[PDB]
């Protein structure tokens, strides 16, 4: 049993984790009481990965809730599926952070890290064969930016033979009007480059542009984006909760999809994109769903993979379809002699077929790729980083707590080196 411990940080992280658990519980067939009620044998063959067995056939969720503010803690606990969570995994503070990386990494963020480790150490002792960990947060505030990286490094040291995957959230000025946000985001990236195995960048600007153009929403709130985020997260973690022909776990996936330790930023995707309404248009076919999931319109990041080079691609289908049809499609589309040939779709794609369809949708495809287009986002962030470091505005807020000015220059140099390495690796052929 390759168990995985899940950790939630920040308000955004807690909300995303709660929605993800809510989505996966209805798919696995778990009622709010805690027992099982599914009508299939494939829903319990891998239930020991994200859950634990207790007395009476209970399946406790394996997630930890940590924050410096209690408001989020109370909101979730009293939620629809909050009674199943373990009350001992609720570690919160009072003051918070106030959008400051220093207050969350060196001042108030270090007075709770030891308490957090207590829960982790104790939760990993009952696991028979631990595989890795997980963390969902955002790079905007101060709690999930400083305390998050701190706990990440803690796990890296105490447990250097395990796996570390994060689901960071890139902030955007179209949603938040914070000013120091960019700095905190960089300070988090400076540590995520070195202490992360796999990263799934979820750009808020791309989601806002999708909700303001495709879905046509007058005022896209937070839930309109959280729904798509939870749907994408449920689509990605399908190979880790249901078996298939592509037998792999987290270590094999990290080895096959990440060839270079410095290059590990992926771009997720999902099709079709539906809002929170309980409606449906028409059951899309396999080629239409493939073209929708491979198009730049359904990308979760504001980056066009057509201008980059694909490294490792892997798609996961969900529905009542057969592997023979998917193989025939992947073999017919990649033929230039056919009339349905396309160039904006790569060739090296690892296909996978799942039996259980998503909740509310009969057929849906999930896109996972490692395109070299994250350099655009890294340059957009570096633009804001340099347009505020020249005037030294709001820089005393970090130096008045204990931070050093050399950390910002080191982070900028690391970001520039990463951008240059991405630009150098974008041009690569093999003849």
């Amino acid at each position: 049993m390759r168990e995985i411990v899940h950790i939630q940080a920040g308000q955004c992280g807690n909300q995303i984790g709660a929605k993800f658990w809510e989505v996966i519980s209805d798919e696995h067939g778990i009622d709010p009481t805690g027992t099982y009620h599914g009508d299939s044998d494939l829903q319990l063959d891998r239930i020991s990965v994200y859950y634990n067995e207790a007395t009476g056939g209970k399946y406790v969720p394996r997630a930890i809730l940590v924050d410096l503010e209690p408001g989020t803690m109370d909101s979730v606990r009293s939620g629809p599926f909050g009674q199943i969570f373990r009350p001992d995994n609720f570690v919160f503070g009072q003051s918070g952070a106030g959008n400051n990386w220093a207050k969350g990494h060196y001042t108030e963020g270090a007075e709770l890290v030891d308490s957090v480790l207590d829960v982790v150490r104790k939760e990993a002792e009952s696991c028979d064969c631990l595989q890795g960990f997980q963390l969902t947060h955002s790079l905007g505030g101060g709690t999930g930016s400083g305390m998050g990286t701190l706990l990440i490094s803690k796990i890296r040291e105490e447990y250097p033979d395990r796996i570390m995957n994060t689901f960071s959230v890139v902030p955007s000025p179209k949603v938040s009007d914070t000013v120091v946000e960019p700095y905190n985001a960089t300070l988090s990236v400076h540590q995520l480059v070195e202490n992360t195995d796999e990263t799934y960048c979820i750009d808020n600007e791309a989601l806002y542009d999708i909700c303001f153009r495709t879905l046509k929403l007058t005022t896209p709130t937070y839930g309109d984006l959280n729904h798509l985020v939870s749907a994408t997260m449920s689509g990605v973690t399908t190979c880790l909760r249901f078996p298939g022909q592509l037998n792999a776990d987290l270590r094999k996936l990290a080895v096959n999809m990440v060839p270079f330790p410095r290059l590990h930023f992926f771009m997720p995707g999902f099709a079709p994109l539906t809002s929170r309404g309980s409606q449906q248009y028409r059951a899309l076919t396999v080629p239409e769903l493939t073209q929708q999931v491979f198009d730049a319109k359904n990308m979760m990041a504001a980056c066009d993979p057509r201008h980059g080079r694909y490294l490792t691609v892997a798609a996961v289908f969900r529905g009542r379809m057969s592997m023979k049809e998917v193989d025939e499609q992947m073999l017919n589309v990649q033929n230039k002699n056919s009339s349905y040939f396309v160039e904006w779709i790569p060739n090296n794609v690892k296909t996978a077929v799942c039996d259980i369809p998503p909740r509310g949708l009969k057929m849906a495809v999930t896109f996972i790729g490692n395109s070299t287009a994250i350099q655009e986002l890294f340059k957009r962030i570096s633009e804001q980083f340099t347009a505020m470091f020249r005037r030294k505005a709001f820089l005393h807020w970090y130096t008045g707590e204990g931070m050093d000015e050399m950390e910002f220059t080191e982070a900028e140099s690391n970001m520039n080196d990463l951008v240059s390495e991405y630009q150098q690796y974008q041009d690569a052929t093999a003849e």
Partner: protein
């Protein structure tokens, strides 16, 4: 929770403060201490080095941090276990040469921030002597109109008819107690 929460609870319960008092006139500080303790010589005269004393006044545990030097005072400004709540600077009125250094130190120490911060109390001793500047001249020289996030106040004093000093000390306590602690 942790050590910081317990320290904050103890500070709110025992009503402990920390007033960083600076100055070099070695003449205007005696009366200030006399306001904190009925004594006149013991724990009243300023020291050349650095001494930490604790007095009780109006039910407030004032932790006076008397520093003699006026250079690189950022070491006393911040502390891993406790911060500074009040700042009292004593200068000379009939001295326009040593005022630029004090202004530069006050500008380098106090900085802008999001919320409120420590409270400043500028003292002007010896006003009856010829050559002393008024409140407007002191405000224009030190440039206190550009210093935000720190409420300042100029209090004059003299050996004769110095208009006392009770409101200048009462306003500091009223602004400090109404900031961290609650009225009711």
């Amino acid at each position: 929770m942790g050590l910081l929460t317990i320290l904050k609870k103890m500070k709110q319960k025992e009503r402990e403060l920390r007033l960083l008092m600076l100055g070099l006139d070695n003449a205007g500080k005696t009366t200030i201490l006399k306001k904190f303790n009925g004594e006149d010589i013991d724990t009243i005269s300023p020291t050349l080095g650095f001494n930490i004393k604790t007095l009780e006044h109006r039910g407030f545990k004032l932790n006076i941090w008397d520093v003699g030097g006026q250079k690189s005072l950022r070491s006393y400004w911040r502390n891993y276990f406790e911060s500074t709540d009040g700042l009292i600077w004593v200068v000379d009125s009939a001295d326009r040469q040593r005022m630029q250094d004090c202004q530069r130190e006050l500008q380098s120490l106090l900085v802008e921030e999001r919320l409120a911060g420590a409270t400043l109390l500028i003292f002007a001793n010896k006003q009856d002597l010829p050559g002393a500047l008024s409140s407007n001249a002191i405000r224009e020289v030190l440039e206190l109109d550009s210093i935000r996030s720190h409420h300042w106040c100029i209090q004059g004093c003299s050996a004769v008819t110095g208009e006392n000093l009770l409101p200048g000390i009462d306003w500091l306590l009223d602004d400090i107690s109404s900031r961290i602690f609650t009225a009711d």
